[PDB]
Amino acid sequence: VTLCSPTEDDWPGMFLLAAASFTDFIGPESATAWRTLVPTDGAVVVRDGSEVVGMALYMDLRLTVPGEVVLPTAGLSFVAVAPTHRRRGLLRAMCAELHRRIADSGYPVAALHASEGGIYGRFGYGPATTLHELTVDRRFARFHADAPGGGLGGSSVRLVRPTEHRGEFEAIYERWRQQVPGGLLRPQVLWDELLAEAKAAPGGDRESFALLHPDGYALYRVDRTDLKLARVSELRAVTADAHCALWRALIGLDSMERISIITHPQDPLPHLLTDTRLARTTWRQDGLWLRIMNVPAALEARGYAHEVGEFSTVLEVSDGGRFALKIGDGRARCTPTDAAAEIEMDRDVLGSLYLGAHRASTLAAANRLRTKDSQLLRRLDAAFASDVPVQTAFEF
Amino acid sequence: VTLCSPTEDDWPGMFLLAAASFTDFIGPESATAWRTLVPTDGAVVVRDGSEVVGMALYMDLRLTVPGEVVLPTAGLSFVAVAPTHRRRGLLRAMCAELHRRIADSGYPVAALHASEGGIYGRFGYGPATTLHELTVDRRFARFHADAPGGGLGGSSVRLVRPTEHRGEFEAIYERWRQQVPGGLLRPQVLWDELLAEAKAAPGGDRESFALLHPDGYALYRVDRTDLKLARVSELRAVTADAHCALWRALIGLDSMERISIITHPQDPLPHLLTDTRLARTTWRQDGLWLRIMNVPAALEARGYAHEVGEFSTVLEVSDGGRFALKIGDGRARCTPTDAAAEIEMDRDVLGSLYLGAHRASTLAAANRLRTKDSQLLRRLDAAFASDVPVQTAFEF
Amino acid sequence: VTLCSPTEDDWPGMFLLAAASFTDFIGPESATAWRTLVPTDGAVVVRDGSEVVGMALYMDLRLTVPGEVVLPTAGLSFVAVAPTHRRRGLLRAMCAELHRRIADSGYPVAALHASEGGIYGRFGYGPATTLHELTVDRRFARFHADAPGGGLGGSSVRLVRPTEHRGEFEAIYERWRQQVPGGLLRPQVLWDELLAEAKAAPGGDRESFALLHPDGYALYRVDRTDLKLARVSELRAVTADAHCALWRALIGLDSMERISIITHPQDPLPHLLTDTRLARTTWRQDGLWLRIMNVPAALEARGYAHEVGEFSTVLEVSDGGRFALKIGDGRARCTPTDAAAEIEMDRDVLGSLYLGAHRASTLAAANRLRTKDSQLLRRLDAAFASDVPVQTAFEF
Amino acid sequence: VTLCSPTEDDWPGMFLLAAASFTDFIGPESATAWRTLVPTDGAVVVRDGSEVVGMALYMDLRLTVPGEVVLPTAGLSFVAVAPTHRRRGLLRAMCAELHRRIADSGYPVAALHASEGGIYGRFGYGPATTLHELTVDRRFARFHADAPGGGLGGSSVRLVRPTEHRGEFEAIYERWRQQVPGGLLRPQVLWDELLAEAKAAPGGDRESFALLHPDGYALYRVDRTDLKLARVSELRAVTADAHCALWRALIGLDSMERISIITHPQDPLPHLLTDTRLARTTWRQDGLWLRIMNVPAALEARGYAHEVGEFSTVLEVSDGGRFALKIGDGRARCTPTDAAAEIEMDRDVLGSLYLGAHRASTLAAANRLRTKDSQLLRRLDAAFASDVPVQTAFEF
Ligand SMILES: C[C@@H]1CCc2c(sc3nc(SC[C@@H]4CCCN(C)C4)nc(N)c23)C1
Ligand SMILES: C[C@@H]1CCc2c(sc3nc(SC[C@@H]4CCCN(C)C4)nc(N)c23)C1
Ligand SMILES: C[C@@H]1CCc2c(sc3nc(SC[C@@H]4CCCN(C)C4)nc(N)c23)C1
Ligand SMILES: C[C@@H]1CCc2c(sc3nc(SC[C@@H]4CCCN(C)C4)nc(N)c23)C1
Ligand code: NA
Ligand code: NA
Ligand code: NA
């Protein structure tokens, strides 16, 4: 039961484990695309004597954090332990080794998408974005007078086949991800994959259409089994105008009863309608999870709210350091210290705070975060707040 | 088709309209309780030649706003137009008259609970609290190590019959409502009503039990039809300790599969569990709606975030005034002006901002709120933010 | 946190815990009936400093075992730990104390009905009867030619109000329980309770009717919500003729689509129909659980199959003794020994074997039961087999 | 409307009837596989003047009966009457002719799988195996301490692609079927078919995986529509160790909520868990049906329980003979006689008794089986009992 980097011979074994571990697995043809995003020495396998009974890897990603600052991010993925080798501490050992490598390679953060909400807390990962399903009953939907782009004259939105407008989708998404906390650089091979899923599959998903605006796009498809439901796979808008225009176009799908979209809690769509309530929140879940690999590097990289005055404190991260933290002018200086700690938290808690998705007040109230001073709590709430609302890019 | 204050003779007519308009109506025995909360000249009826074809009233309420400041609040309720007299502008006329009276009586705000999410925007009401259903699968629920009150020794929570501990429930709720934005004074007659619904009803609801803590209580009942579901009617906790203790006790209902509760978005319960995801958000809806009756009176009454520096602007409310607004030291001075407006909004939008439930960034993005300066937007977001999270007291 | 026999003052506290612990609880009016079946010193309570936070008791029952032998049986019931006092070893301590008393009082067995299938194994209880739901689609049901009581001339079955024929129901059930493994003496107060549930309850259950035969009866009611479903609460038949006659009468409920009954795996009803498959098994569950309190006393009391030759062995019960077991002539002699054990099992396993519901082959295959000799396994299978199929009397 | 053996020209007609009669029909490509198992003169067709309006055949099978004795078995299959030719006694005539041929060819038994539970009784077929669906909620499943193969060190179970381990599956199944009542020799062409269904089908079933042990295997696939459900198509285990090991591996499918398997009533899986009840029986049905073609030949071929003493009787089979039956030493001698019958039954009843699935007590109680002597009933129960529990091989 040894732990190594895989050789070319180990990959077929890994694809077998993958097919049996993940029900959304696509196959070797398509795993060869994603494989380009794994750096040399980005993968571990566990062999038994030999069949692969365990695997984990990371991908080289670019995460946009508050302040439009882009960080190199180890994206943990393809983690799997054979059902034959459960409760063997095989995950513990693989996660421990990839964390050594990610840290030594000089990634300040790692991120993942959690198959379950209870595995990853203990390895230092915190839920850091929030997924929000909105289902609109579009038969009753009337736009408010205050809504943009409701004057007469031509629409600036077009209905198009996705594949004939790759260039414009790449351009818009590139602008978007650079300016939104949670944004990820989407490499050529992931666009290749996105547009292969646009096409109708024999007894699978139906054709995907596109609403294209100069500063926005929406991909959507009719649900396989519910033919009055349109599922918006992805809506990226750079301007409020583009966002409204596209939603005008979606409410326009007159043969549909319901528009469905996975979006973020601050999505303005309910405020565009005369009836806020027609945009019902049907489902909510943790999106992206962060492990802060280097506390000073990460706290120093991001922007902070200008609207909170300058202030100083001592932050302890359980088994991850103690730091003089000083914040003003939306910059933070973070330096070693042995001064008495004023605030304490496990490293997962920092992950959750880091993109402004969760308030320190909220985590303090659960005692996930300790301080005696409730003024310092108000000051952290305010500073870590993200002016631009945090969103989730793509799952990996 | 005349509009008057009702006489004693008009009430039976109103109770008939009530029974046919509201499916949760309880009956004259119980409408005589609530009637004590209606002030003289707090009711209008519309007679046809005579049967009551329309009615509306307000109740004298005390709403707690940010800064632990308590405001006299006209609580609009018992609004109904006969199905025989729809699309007759009968609501428009009743709302217009009660608004004259509320304003002349010197209420700074009115509030209501909306049967539909699209009626009340046009009368100046904004959704100002957010209801959040959490359903916990309590068979998997393990409290985090960080969670309070998980040392050995006796529990400070008791299982009790609600009716034998009215005094302690009144005491705790009194402390609670005084310290939480959204808090309402609950008068004797509404406690009378709450505890009449505690008892099992023949082929109705099942017995209600109580978990009592020195600084918290939870009322809960098993669902009529789903006997693995416990419905938490009401949980009030003054301390984080009390909140955790009570949830420890609810996860302890071992014969239940699921605990259900209508709570607020900042409820810390998911952070108390090793798996955040076990606390699934199953339903979301607008809670309390506010109409700001007097813009200067209201902006001046509430506290604002100390963590935003002093700043000044000109706010216009569409057909509700234009004001020099100056905010610093968590106080606001609000005075008439004809200076060019820097920010504009309909009066409903102010209602939504007023308890800190909705960010001005979010409403700006929908163009419900107009400014050219995105620094001023950040400053409003920050100032109107409520340090203590806003909650919903009881429906009326 | 002390453990005592309750005083008269402790009972109201216990009824509160009961109402909050059991959703089928009926109330003090009706708990005073069952209380007559609890002997002096048959109850324990756990007080905290004082509110009852834990309770358990047994009832004096008479269980019929193979050989038509009737045993005094401690019926464990009304077991409950407050949700405020979970994971406090409060059950462990209450079960330990009642087991001391039951054993000292000279009960050879204890029995219970398990709210969950995973609590009671570790206290020495084994699932010993099997509940079997049969749902008949009675629109297709044709009796086989071989079926009894299908000649012309009058029926010997009558449709009657249950309450007007208590005497005949008592008589038939008395004959039944004396001749069937799993049979329990039903005392006057439990007949009182059975017939109080016969009557329709306002927005509850519907009227219960009775099909009465000289040697059998069936109580049945139409389902509250599904009006094409008849639920057979109880069918007791002493003769195969009585059993067939009653089923002829139930298939005769022409306004019903489906007859539903909780019965045993060897119920002959499918063999009475031309289509065995119309009697679909819709649900299966452990019925009565036994703890063998005294291994020699119990093994010696029951009859064994005459059709297996005489044979001898050494049985070890993990922490419950080691015995020379000799079986022939359907009697067993069971005496102490230090001779090497030939077969081993935890005490719960013996409970399961004891009424012939579970084969020792089946438990051996799971390694719940150890022997090197598969001939001895065949001999236990054969001996412990019950010629009359084992059934479940009433739940307590 | 004539009855003949089909010619090569008749087959296309039969495949058309097949497609319209059976919804699981695969097509001519695959019917050419199964056709190898039909002997010359094993098929009848009914032509109308000519289109095939009726067909029936048998296949040459090897059935394992108690005593590990393997019998040549006519497997009735592909029986169909056009919807245009119902209630024409076309089945009666086809069944009559195939029964002549099967009997003359010297098959002692015939078997079938019944599309409905009420057609085949009248042609002498008895339900002789019992199918049992177990659904495990694997999130709660904890193996008992008594369970095998729960020490540390490597697992002896492997996750593998079925197609790369045909040889080992054939070997294990061969051992299995030779030692289990209900066992059928699986010929090369049926393995060909089994492994063609292993592969994912476009908008059909998902990939099938394999858990392989030295003495056991399990094939399983994720359900098409319910992605938290794993359906175990087939689990064959020769040793109790192999059976436990494989179930440990299946409980290990951590991304699944439920494991589903069609198994037999004596499956030991519930006894392997600390909670017996987690293995819920979700569905039950008649499996294999037997027609005893030659009563003496068949009664003489099988083994009987050694644990019942020697005994003699006279058995009458309604229109199938009367026999001196003598049983001792687990052998039976069965010879003609005109001595007064002591026990009587239709021939279908014998079919049901023959593999020990159904107790003669149970069939006697329905009066499907007549005797005056209840000691003789106990002796038949005991003798016909199968020490190794009877199972169902594959459907045909
Ligand atoms: C070696 C590469 C690494 C990652 C990788 C593949 S295929 C593939 N497909 C996908 S599809 C996205 C879902 C979302 C949630 C988690 N699931 C695993 C998948 N993702 C990968 N990371 C990959 C092979
Ligand atoms: C004259 C008084 C005025 C208000 C009043 C009654 S009865 C009563 N019952 C209730 S119960 C609460 C639900 C919640 C949502 C809106 N529904 C109307 C009811 N409420 C009242 N305001 C009242 C008579
Ligand atoms: C002090 C006596 C002891 C037992 C007792 C009562 S009320 C009552 N009602 C019932 S009703 C039967 C269900 C079946 C499964 C388990 N549940 C608890 C109930 N049973 C009792 N033992 C009792 C009070
Ligand atoms: C001439 C041969 C005879 C039997 C045969 C085929 S195809 C085929 N496929 C199948 S698949 C198994 C199901 C199970 C229940 C009954 N159904 C009929 C099918 N079976 C056959 N006997 C056959 C052609
Ligand atoms: Na998001
Ligand atoms: Na709220
Ligand atoms: Na039973």
Ligand code: NA
């Ligand atoms: Na079977």
